[PDB]
């Protein structure tokens, strides 16, 4: 613990502030590794600012990487840390101009919701996740639509029976009768998990 707290943190902060983009590709891997290795008492004050300043960089590569490697972060930092400041960091990765980060966030949110406690799950879903879902469904890009159609059919057992007819059925019928076949192939290949 002392060796990573004394000398590895300065090295990581200097590598995170590099003027090159290819170094963040592996800096985010080092970050998730040290976050999974370290205990809970040394995350909310050491690794959070670095990932926060790296997830909002001028390049889209580091944003794509932190969007991919997000389940390990949200499962290692615990639910409370995800409740404090991970909500904006996850929201800024769904409202970008590049479709890669949005598709990655859509693919990861399904299992991100799986490791969420039942104290503020439905609230943050009906208050914050629902507007992002509604604004990403009506997007013109086909890749994000196909990703959503392939990933959103796994959140039905989490919301419950009385929550599918609320908002899941409209988006399902919208993605079903779409113009491109790529999104239909994904929305029709995952219809058995909503039968129960």
């Amino acid at each position: 613990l002392d060796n990573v707290k004394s000398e590895i943190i300065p090295m990581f902060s200097n590598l995170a502030s590099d003027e090159q983009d290819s170094v963040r590709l592996l800096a985010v891997e080092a970050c998730v590794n040290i976050a999974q290795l370290l205990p809970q008492e040394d995350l909310e004050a050491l690794v959070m600012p670095t990932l926060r300043q790296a997830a909002e960089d001028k390049s889209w590569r580091v944003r794509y990487m932190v969007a991919d490697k997000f389940t390990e972060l949200q499962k290692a930092v615990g639910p409370e840390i995800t409740k404090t400041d991970l909500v904006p960091a996850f929201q800024n990765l769904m409202k970008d101009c590049e479709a890669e980060v949005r598709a990655a966030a859509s693919h990861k949110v399904k299992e991100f919701c799986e490791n969420l406690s039942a104290d503020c799950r439905e609230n943050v879903i009906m208050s914050q996740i629902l507007p992002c879902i509604k604004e990403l469904v009506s997007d013109a890009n086909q890749h994000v639509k196909s990703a959503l159609a392939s990933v959103i059919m796994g959140l039905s057992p989490i919301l419950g029976k009385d929550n599918t007819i609320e908002h899941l059925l409209p988006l399902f019928l919208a993605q079903l009768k779409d113009e491109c076949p790529e999104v239909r192939l994904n929305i029709i290949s995952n219809l058995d998990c909503v039968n129960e």
Binding site: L25, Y64, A99, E100, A103, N141, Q142, H143, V144
Partner: protein
């Protein structure tokens, strides 16, 4: 600039020993010539044109303002059908090559004859063996017709120009085996009606007999393209006064080879003015000659000429250098040269240069000198009396050289002729209009000729239709294009297509694609949200 002349006549349908007709072999030879010329790092400025044996509105396939794509597309779809009208086709090609000459300033006919204003062009005139026809019989003279001369063409009296060479390919490939392979490195002549026409311009005429000989002649033709400076030499009048190291006795007299005027546009001065005595008042100008009749005299006459005179390096192509090599290339000595046909008021020829060789004794440098150098080089009221022997207009270029030192002359006597300036702008405007009209209707064929002309032997006006190649029958739009065999099935197909209410409906039954299917062209009209950052 290269203008390929492929006849595509009906006589080019006979099959070779390989299995392809002469037209296919000619097109393949053109393609291999393209891929061979592309090896030299100088094919980024040339332009390719195509000329066939067709009507004047249909003879030209690709001319000015035509890229390589349309040229290759027109050469691809060449059809061999028609008579062998060689004279009319050569005339059309020469008129096409001389469309933008009277507008830019080349061959102005009023201010000397500048050799540094070049427009190179090489004709291949790939035709058949012999027996050319003109819709009446078989001629054996090959005379170019003169029916509609271009405005401003009576001042040259010859169709070809200063830099227009003419090579020929006959493609005399046997039909059985083409086993004639005795001489390996030997390319004989064709000995046909096109041979004198080619030799007059300055290019030989190859005789293709085997594919190996075809490759040899194509590899020998790519080394004969450069700046076109073709001048004619004559032995008169010295009676072979080459008594330097041996005794003379020759065929190296009427040399009509070219000269390589490589630039450092070309840079140079002191041109060959003309061959006549120009008067101050001359309404009609005598017609010039495409090849200047300039003659050399074998005299030492102080070959050492060193001065601040602007230097020229118009390299001469070695074709008749045997007569010079017989005299050890004339080391440290030269021989004067002079243009004939009344170069001055009253005299026969005036020495205006020499043919001194280089120190390396490789080729002739063609040292071009002023009109009369041995007098102005070596003021006590001398230059004012000396400037009366030179032609008037000739004071134009030389004064520029005097600009290097000072400016004693002016525009007082800088006048060629009061009548030569007139009737010149109108001719240039007419030539520009003709060139525009020719370049406008160059690719738009618009034949619209499909009739049988039913003769009596609704009256006197009937004509049965012919089979249209590119008809593209509309099966879903037009009901007349549906034959009787596949009528009910096609009826059900049209019914299902109309009752489907799909998006972006069409009237074509099955339109797969065109002849070409590019990958990038189809992939460009798509969207792929990916960059492969890893």
């Amino acid at each position: 600039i290269l203008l390929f002349l492929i006849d595509t006549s009906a006589s080019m349908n006979q099959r070779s020993h390989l299995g392809t007709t002469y037209l296919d072999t000619a097109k393949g030879a053109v393609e291999t010539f393209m891929k061979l010329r592309a090896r030299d790092p100088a094919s980024r400025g040339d332009r390719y044109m195509l000329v066939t044996f067709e009507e004047p509105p249909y003879a030209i396939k690709a001319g000015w303002k035509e890229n390589h794509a349309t040229f290759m597309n027109e050469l691809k779809n060449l059809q061999a059908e028609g008579l062998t009208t060689l004279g009319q086709s050569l005339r059309t090609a020469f008129d096409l090559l001389n469309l933008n000459r009277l507008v830019t300033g080349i061959d102005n006919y009023g201010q000397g004859r500048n050799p540094f204003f070049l427009e190179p062009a090489i004709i291949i005139t790939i035709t058949d063996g012999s027996k050319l026809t003109t819709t009446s019989g078989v001629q054996d003279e090959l005379h170019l017709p003169l029916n509609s001369p271009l405005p401003g063409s009576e001042l040259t009296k010859e169709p070809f120009r200063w830099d227009q060479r003419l090579f020929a390919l006959v493609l005399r490939l046997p039909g059985t085996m083409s086993v004639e392979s005795e001489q390996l490195t030997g390319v004989p002549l064709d000995d046909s009606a096109i041979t004198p026409m080619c030799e007059v311009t300055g290019g030989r005429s190859y005789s293709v007999c085997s594919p190996r000989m075809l490759n040899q002649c194509l590899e020998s033709l790519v080394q004969k393209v450069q700046s076109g400076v073709v001048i004619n030499f004559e032995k008169a009048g010295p009676d072979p006064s080459p008594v330097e190291d041996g005794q003379p006795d020759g065929s190296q007299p009427w040399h009509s080879c070219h000269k390589l005027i490589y630039v450092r546009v070309p840079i140079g001065h002191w041109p060959v003015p003309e061959s006549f005595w120009p008067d101050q008042n001359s309404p009609t100008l005598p017609p010039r000659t495409s090849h200047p009749v300039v003659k050399f005299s074998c005299t030492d006459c102080e070959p050492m000429v060193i001065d601040k005179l602007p230097f020229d390096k118009y390299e001469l192509e070695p074709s008749p250098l045997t007569q010079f090599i017989l005299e050890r290339k004339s080391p440290q000595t030269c021989w004067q040269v002079y243009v004939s046909n009344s170069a001055k008021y009253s005299e026969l020829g005036h020495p205006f240069g020499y043919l001194k060789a280089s120190t390396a004794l490789n080729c002739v440098n063609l040292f071009v000198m002023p009109y009369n150098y041995p007098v102005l080089l070596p003021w006590r009221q001398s230059f004012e009396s000396y400037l009366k022997t030179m032609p008037p207009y000739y004071l134009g270029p030389l004064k520029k050289a005097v600009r290097m030192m000072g400016a004693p002359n002016l525009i007082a006597d800088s006048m060629e002729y009061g009548l030569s300036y007139s009737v010149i702008s109108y001719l240039k405007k007419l030539s520009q209009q003709a060139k525009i009209e020719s370049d406008r209707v160059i690719g738009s064929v618009g034949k619209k000729v499909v009739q049988e002309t039913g003769i009596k032997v609704e009256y006197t006006g009937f004509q049965v239709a012919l089979l249209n190649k590119d008809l593209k029958p509309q099966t879903f739009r037009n009901a007349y294009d549906i034959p009787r065999r596949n009528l009910l099935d096609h009826l059900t197909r049209m019914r299902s297509n109309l009752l489907k209410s799909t998006r972006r409906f069409l009237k074509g039954q099955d339109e797969d694609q065109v002849h070409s299917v590019p990958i990038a062209q189809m992939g460009n009209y798509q969207e792929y949200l990916k960059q492969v950052p890893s």
